[PDB]
Ligand binder design. Structure first.
Ligand SMILES: *[C@@H]1O[C@H](CO)[C@@H](O[C@@H]2O[C@H](CO)[C@@H](O)[C@H](O)[C@H]2NC(C)=O)[C@H](O)[C@H]1NC(C)=O
Ligand SMILES: *[C@@H]1O[C@H](CO)[C@@H](O[C@@H]2O[C@H](CO)[C@@H](O)[C@H](O)[C@H]2NC(C)=O)[C@H](O)[C@H]1NC(C)=O
Ligand SMILES: *[C@@H]1O[C@H](CO)[C@@H](O[C@@H]2O[C@H](CO)[C@@H](O)[C@H](O)[C@H]2NC(C)=O)[C@H](O)[C@H]1NC(C)=O
Ligand SMILES: *[C@@H]1O[C@H](CO)[C@@H](O[C@@H]2O[C@H](CO)[C@@H](O)[C@H](O)[C@H]2NC(C)=O)[C@H](O)[C@H]1NC(C)=O
Ligand SMILES: *[C@@H]1O[C@H](CO)[C@@H](O[C@@H]2O[C@H](CO)[C@@H](O)[C@H](O)[C@H]2NC(C)=O)[C@H](O)[C@H]1NC(C)=O
Ligand SMILES: *[C@@H]1O[C@H](CO)[C@@H](O[C@@H]2O[C@H](CO)[C@@H](O)[C@H](O)[C@H]2NC(C)=O)[C@H](O)[C@H]1NC(C)=O
Ligand SMILES: *[C@@H]1O[C@H](CO)[C@@H](O[C@@H]2O[C@H](CO)[C@@H](O)[C@H](O)[C@H]2NC(C)=O)[C@H](O)[C@H]1NC(C)=O
Ligand SMILES: *[C@@H]1O[C@H](CO)[C@@H](O[C@@H]2O[C@H](CO)[C@@H](O)[C@H](O)[C@H]2NC(C)=O)[C@H](O)[C@H]1NC(C)=O
Ligand SMILES: *[C@@H]1O[C@H](CO)[C@@H](O)[C@H](O)[C@H]1NC(C)=O
Ligand SMILES: *[C@@H]1O[C@H](CO)[C@@H](O)[C@H](O)[C@H]1NC(C)=O
Ligand SMILES: *[C@@H]1O[C@H](CO)[C@@H](O)[C@H](O)[C@H]1NC(C)=O
Ligand SMILES: *[C@@H]1O[C@H](CO)[C@@H](O)[C@H](O)[C@H]1NC(C)=O
Ligand SMILES: *[C@@H]1O[C@H](CO)[C@@H](O)[C@H](O)[C@H]1NC(C)=O
Ligand SMILES: *[C@@H]1O[C@H](CO)[C@@H](O)[C@H](O)[C@H]1NC(C)=O
Ligand SMILES: *[C@@H]1O[C@H](CO)[C@@H](O)[C@H](O)[C@H]1NC(C)=O
Ligand SMILES: *[C@@H]1O[C@H](CO)[C@@H](O)[C@H](O)[C@H]1NC(C)=O
Ligand SMILES: *[C@@H]1O[C@H](CO)[C@@H](O)[C@H](O)[C@H]1NC(C)=O
Ligand SMILES: *[C@@H]1O[C@H](CO)[C@@H](O)[C@H](O)[C@H]1NC(C)=O
Ligand SMILES: *[C@@H]1O[C@H](CO)[C@@H](O)[C@H](O)[C@H]1NC(C)=O
Ligand SMILES: *[C@@H]1O[C@H](CO)[C@@H](O)[C@H](O)[C@H]1NC(C)=O
Ligand SMILES: *[C@@H]1O[C@H](CO)[C@@H](O)[C@H](O)[C@H]1NC(C)=O
Ligand SMILES: *[C@@H]1O[C@H](CO)[C@@H](O)[C@H](O)[C@H]1NC(C)=O
Ligand SMILES: *[C@@H]1O[C@H](CO)[C@@H](O)[C@H](O)[C@H]1NC(C)=O
Ligand SMILES: *[C@@H]1O[C@H](CO)[C@@H](O)[C@H](O)[C@H]1NC(C)=O
Ligand SMILES: *[C@@H]1O[C@H](CO)[C@@H](O)[C@H](O)[C@H]1NC(C)=O
Ligand SMILES: *[C@@H]1O[C@H](CO)[C@@H](O)[C@H](O)[C@H]1NC(C)=O
Lengths: 122, 431, 431, 122, 122
């Protein structure tokens, strides 16, 4: 056990076994200021959980999806990503490709929603 | 390779947010506007970039220390009736404390609206302005009315911890040579900061936190003479205050339920209020400051310490609060030396009762007299210097801006926003 | 056996939370700080432990009734000009109401700042303190200024329902023999409480809720004489008030837009204000109280009711409000009897206009005169007794602490926190 | 229909028929008193949903796990728990074993998260 | 791309392909006004997410359920519902029966939650 953000400097493979530690800490003059800090924490948490549900990843911490990895985003191989890079370094590399990936996941699930809707119709 | 979404990745961005107070007789920065406290996690291989000069905790703490100050002064007496004409005579009519006082007699309202009250009080010459037994008036009377410093609230600073809300983290730089800027090899995630005492002072960082290994020089741009230099000591320099007088506080009923506390009489040791700094300890502390200050200007340069240039009494003097009474010490014997490649220093301090604290106009405060003798023991844990725009560099004491006082305590802390949603390639494929 | 997680289990823990008001001419406890209402579910086989003496609804309702009181007094007249010197003469110069009054003449401010106003008013002797046609002054003038009870807000208590937020439930004890503590066999979950009228009174619980089958004795520790005894009747004892005088309210303009309502003249029936309690009904009600009170002290013990010991007029008298004017009745003929193993009782009541209601100092209130004759019909639904520290037990009336008045209405209610996440063994196994 | 907390006195078997009755009732300066109670209910609800999500139980009132029932927590047989006890009695018996069970459920899910993530790449 | 509420006039079949657009727009003196509106937006969002959870539809935008259509709620066939009407016209038609269906979906899931629960015990 490392603690909150303990694996920030750890490799992506090693830091992915402690996702629960960071996940559980995202939810919980000194009056309204302290009260609006709690409402901001809930709204920030709820819009992240909404994104997971839209991508079909609701209730999951590691969600393998159907969107293929465009090599333009990152040409590195798996060995030097999950064993040589940390999540802070990785976020810097793909910070500009984040929004195009988000749209790809959003539409891919929307296609899967109608694909399973038609399969159940038979 | 396929995109796989990871939720909860240890990724953070720089952010500005509202940190809530936490703390462990009412106070100005009371515990009724804070939260009880309860911690530190070492983030290995993490090298974060800090910037103590564009830190928003410093800007927020300034707002909150001000806000708790005003919030603590509203419920107690406003001294509008104290703008009357004062018939002031000298107290001594001849070096002492009594040469700093005027014995001022005035008509005051009674608890009954139709009755007056011929009373008198000893006002410092710094609080009364002559009108042209002469006729005087209180100094902050053409600008505002002075809400009396409420007698049951203490000015003693209690440590306050600024704690980040959910979704945010406070990064603490554990590097011992970290000036104020650039990468910090050793970082930690604290739930929230150490107890930061909001000690309000100028030209000298009384109390607070020491450096770890050596005197630290911290300037936003050391080559710019318009930027203050925040020196931080490694060994504190103890400074002893005093007001030797045995003051006699006197109560005047200026209205129904409202009382005005006045200096009725002054007896006892009438030596001027002063602060003592050990001459040997201060000399070796400036020696350490000079040694760490030649690293930015040269080995052969001449480091000269002069005294404050000019301006308000709050900026030309070591203004501070001690025992509920506000001092304004000269500190011209502290900063008087030229450095080439049992004894004590006594700093004459004046005292005021009408305080415009946060460099503002229109909101004064009348600090009531403190009964008895006031004694003081503080640690000088830092300096605020300004450089003069040749082989000689002259460093005058600085200040005025209260943010540089708390910038010296929040230099190691940083607030980040956790970004827990990250995507990365993997051999997965959704079934 | 494997762990299976159930979400939504009917499990609750004791909790303290903020219950919000609900209610179904502005009022002190107005509907503008409450919510419209709309319910009760019987929880079979549930035996919960209640404690009316460590109930936080009582402590919160005390804060809220105070808070709505002050919030209703800020927007109306503050009587700072009423601290002048009063030249007061007797009204009768000889048993009547007029022997309780002083005819006080004073200089008052006009709506124009530079003009005065020679006015007079009839002040009760309980509101004026002599200064040494003599010279007097209002009683709460060296302690505070009296914000005038605003004439358009009524003091009549409207029922307020305290409703629990989401995630909490209010448990209601339906047991009819439930004293105040221990298991309650019959429990119910109400959305929120019955309409609790915040009737403010001492020594007698005017109006409110009756017992179901028999007079209930409720003490935190019946063997401790320092604890008040909350008697609750099963049949109400009707008490009739009156101020027979035909008062004449008079308006004085003390400033721009501010008016001071004064008693200009008093005519009509000048008998002292009094309350009538039926002598037969009160005797049989004390008989029921004594019968239920010998169960805790013995069958052969002597139950004696004496009158209030001493202290403030608010604690030695049945202080209450009726018709907007505040009464202070003796109740020494009510509690005067010794019990061994058409007619009426008249209680002489005084009246005050300057009220320090919530046992506080520094916040008074001037209740303006009520035009006309005041008449009153209330139910005595309880008592607050104190026991004297021998075969004779003496029970004096008590009070002072306003929380014991609302502790008698919130004794059956309890706030719990729902814990909907529970784990239990089952033959399941996740696939 | 018994209503909110109606089955509080029913046996654990019968009280489980009505988990949705209590579930829907957990969610819905004088303004701040009401406003701060609303925020407390939201963040109290979200912390329970977050716990279910990290155990692989999100969106389920009854969730089956892969954590065997250690008899140290309670050795009573299945017949004397679901037909003799009420949920209030049960909560008092396993109150001290609650936190150790919570850790096991969290450790059981992230083990299944990685095992399914690994098996999905084959 | 049409935008938020852009498919309001589109037929029900065409407007059901843009659910992610409306879903992500439901979450994001004079200080309580801003703050109390935010708390009410979070509370309303959680009420609709709770309903989807107790129907078995958590994390889904299109959720095919086991509740049969009575034809007493609407006698129109699929051709004239998904190709002629819009979601606003449809909403005004089954507004009377909305709470009837909302009760059937909850009851069906609760029965289905235990039939699957009893199936794992074998
Ligand atoms: C207090 O008020 C009194 C009057 O109430 C002041 O005495 C007056 O002073 C003026 C000169 O400014 C004379 O012309 C009057 O005759 C005085 N009236 C008296 C003595 O009854 C007195 O100066 C005031 N004291 C102050 C302002 O300190
Ligand atoms: C309030 O009065 C003070 C005192 O007269 C004013 O300060 C003086 O200003 C003049 C003009 O610049 C200087 O010569 C004096 O030396 C000042 N006295 C002190 C004690 O500083 C002040 O300007 C006035 N404020 C306002 C708003 O009118
Ligand atoms: C620096 O800290 C010292 C120690 O806390 C302060 O001195 C204390 O002040 C309080 C209140 O006046 C006294 O009750 C203590 O007895 C004092 N301690 C000692 C050792 O004298 C001092 O006031 C602080 N300096 C400031 C606030 O400028
Ligand atoms: C602060 O100390 C300085 C130095 O002691 C005082 O000012 C100077 O004092 C020296 C000799 O002590 C004189 O030669 C200078 O002419 C003084 N300069 C002045 C008076 O401007 C000073 O008086 C002390 N106090 C303050 C408030 O500055
Ligand atoms: C109202 O004010 C008048 C003055 O405006 C008071 O009358 C004065 O009373 C004093 C005695 O206290 C006399 O010495 C003055 O000569 C009086 N002045 C007159 C009559 O013009 C009067 O007593 C006040 N009334 C009150 C306080 O009730
Ligand atoms: C305000 O004045 C009243 C009246 O003079 C004070 O109450 C009196 O106190 C003395 C001294 O204990 C008693 O002998 C009197 O019987 C009291 N009078 C009444 C009517 O109670 C009161 O103490 C004063 N308050 C303050 C804060 O000074
Ligand atoms: C107890 O309740 C009675 C009945 O509500 C109150 O008497 C009423 O008071 C209002 C306002 O003064 C009148 O409009 C009603 O006509 C009264 N009713 C009757 C039957 O007289 C009484 O004031 C309450 N007792 C208190 C508040 O102490
Ligand atoms: C309240 O009633 C009592 C009793 O009637 C009054 O006080 C006593 O009255 C009896 C005779 O009626 C006297 O023998 C006592 O000496 C009285 N005790 C006193 C005056 O202390 C009392 O006056 C009434 N009013 C109050 C406010 O107590
Ligand atoms: C830091 O890196 C070392 C190896 O470079 C590794 O052993 C260690 O686990 C890393 N720190 C953390 C917190 O994982
Ligand atoms: C991959 O990214 C490039 C831009 O970086 C883009 O032009 C290309 O269309 C993308 N390929 C796919 C399959 O999305
Ligand atoms: C009062 O003191 C001042 C300064 O000490 C002095 O200038 C003045 O002459 C004194 N007034 C007297 C002695 O009357
Ligand atoms: C502070 O230290 C960092 C790292 O050593 C350095 O890059 C920076 O220049 C220093 N600050 C100044 C003002 O030079
Ligand atoms: C300061 O030192 C002087 C002598 O140098 C002494 O008389 C005085 O009492 C000292 N004051 C304090 C506060 O130490
Ligand atoms: C300050 O006072 C302390 C005792 O309160 C004394 O031990 C110390 O020597 C003093 N130091 C100076 C510099 O006056
Ligand atoms: C600085 O010292 C000089 C003399 O050395 C003095 O004239 C001046 O007033 C001082 N300035 C201050 C104390 O601000
Ligand atoms: C000054 O610091 C020392 C330790 O460096 C401490 O023992 C002493 O109490 C401090 N004096 C104060 C805070 O007055
Ligand atoms: C006024 O009344 C009081 C009490 O009733 C009495 O003591 C006083 O003598 C009266 N003053 C007169 C009659 O002048
Ligand atoms: C109130 O009743 C309960 C149950 O009968 C009993 O245990 C308790 O002792 C009673 N209260 C007192 C103060 O005796
Ligand atoms: C109280 O009773 C008396 C006679 O005993 C009567 O004169 C009076 O009017 C009654 N007052 C009330 C309010 O009932
Ligand atoms: C009180 O007054 C009512 C009428 O208002 C009357 O019927 C009743 O008999 C009176 N009771 C007493 C005890 O005065
Ligand atoms: C209680 O009654 C006695 C006489 O019986 C009286 O002296 C005393 O003042 C009364 N106390 C009160 C009414 O508070
Ligand atoms: C007193 O209670 C009775 C019923 O017990 C009720 O009819 C009557 O109106 C009440 N009187 C009041 C509240 O004044
Ligand atoms: C209470 O227990 C009885 C049998 O002991 C049972 O029939 C009844 O359903 C229980 N109450 C509830 C609300 O389930
Ligand atoms: C059950 O818990 C006990 C601790 O009370 C532990 O010693 C035992 O090993 C556990 N049984 C298992 C893990 O099978
Ligand atoms: C409006 O209706 C026309 C055909 O009637 C259709 O082509 C168009 O897409 C509709 N508008 C939207 C926004 O879908
Ligand atoms: C349709 O609803 C009606 C009541 O509106 C009901 O009687 C009927 O049974 C329902 N149809 C089916 C198939 O359940």
């Amino acid at each position: 056990f490392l603690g909150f953000l303990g694996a920030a400097g750890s490799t992506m493979g090693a830091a992915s076994m402690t996702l629960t530690v960071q996940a559980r800490n995202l939810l919980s003059v000194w009056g309204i200021k302290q009260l609006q800090a709690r409402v901001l924490a809930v709204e920030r948490y709820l819009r992240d959980q909404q994104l997971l549900g839209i991508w079909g990843c609701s209730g999951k911490l590691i969600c393998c999806t159907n969107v293929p990895w465009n090599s333009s985003w990152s040409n590195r191989n798996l060995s030097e990503i999950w064993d040589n890079m940390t999540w802070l370094q990785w976020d810097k590399e793909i910070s500009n490709y984040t929004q195009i990936i988000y749209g790809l996941l959003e539409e891919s699930q929307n296609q899967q929603e109608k694909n399973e809707q038609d399969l159940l119709a038979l | 390779l396929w995109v796989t979404v990871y939720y909860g990745v240890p990724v953070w961005k720089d952010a500005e947010t509202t940190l809530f107070c936490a703390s462990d007789k009412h106070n100005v920065w009371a515990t009724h506007a804070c939260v009880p406290t309860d911690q530190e996690i070492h983030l290995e291989n993490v090298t974060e970039e800090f910037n103590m000069w564009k830190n928003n905790m410093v800007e927020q703490m300034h707002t909150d220390i001000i806000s708790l100050w005003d919030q603590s002064l509203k419920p107690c007496v406003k001294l509008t009736p104290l703008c009357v004409t004062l018939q002031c005579t000298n107290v001594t009519n001849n070096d002492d404390m009594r040469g700093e006082l005027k014995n001022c007699s005035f008509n005051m309202t009674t608890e009954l609206r139709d009755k007056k009250q011929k009373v008198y009080s000893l006002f410092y010459r710094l609080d009364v302005v002559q009108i042209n037994n002469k006729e005087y008036r209180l100094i902050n009377c053409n600008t505002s009315a002075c809400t009396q410093a409420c007698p049951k609230v203490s000015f003693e600073p209690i440590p306050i911890h600024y704690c980040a809300p959910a979704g945010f983290a406070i990064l603490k730089c554990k590097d011992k040579k970290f000036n104020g800027t650039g990468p910090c090899p050793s970082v930690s995630t604290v739930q929230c900061t150490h107890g930061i005492k909001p000690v309000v002072s100028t030209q000298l960082l009384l109390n607070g936190s020491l450096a770890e290994e050596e005197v630290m020089i911290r300037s936003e741009n050391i080559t710019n003479n318009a930027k203050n230099i925040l020196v931080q000591f490694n060994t504190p320099v103890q400074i002893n205050c005093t007001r030797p007088n045995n003051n006699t506080r006197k109560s005047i009923r200026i209205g129904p339920g409202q009382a005005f506390y006045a200096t009725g009489d002054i007896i006892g040791d009438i030596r001027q209020a002063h602060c003592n700094v050990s001459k040997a300890t201060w000399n070796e502390t400036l020696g350490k400051v000079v040694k760490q200050l030649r690293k930015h200007f040269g080995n052969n340069t001449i480091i000269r310490f002069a005294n404050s240039s000019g301006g308000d009494l709050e900026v030309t003097t070591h203004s501070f609060n001690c025992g509920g009474e506000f001092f304004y010490c000269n500190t011209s014997g502290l900063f008087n030396s030229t450095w080439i490649s049992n004894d004590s220093i006594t700093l004459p301090c004046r005292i005021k009762q009408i305080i415009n604290m946060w460099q503002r106009i229109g909101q004064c405060m009348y600090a009531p007299p403190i009964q008895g003798v006031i004694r003081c023991v503080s640690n000088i844990t830092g300096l605020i210097l300004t450089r003069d725009g040749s082989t000689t560099e002259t460093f005058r004491p600085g200040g005025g801006d209260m943010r540089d006082n708390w910038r010296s305590e929040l230099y190691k802390y940083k607030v980040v926003k956790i970004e827990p949603l990250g995507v990365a390639p993997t051999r997965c494929k959704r079934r």
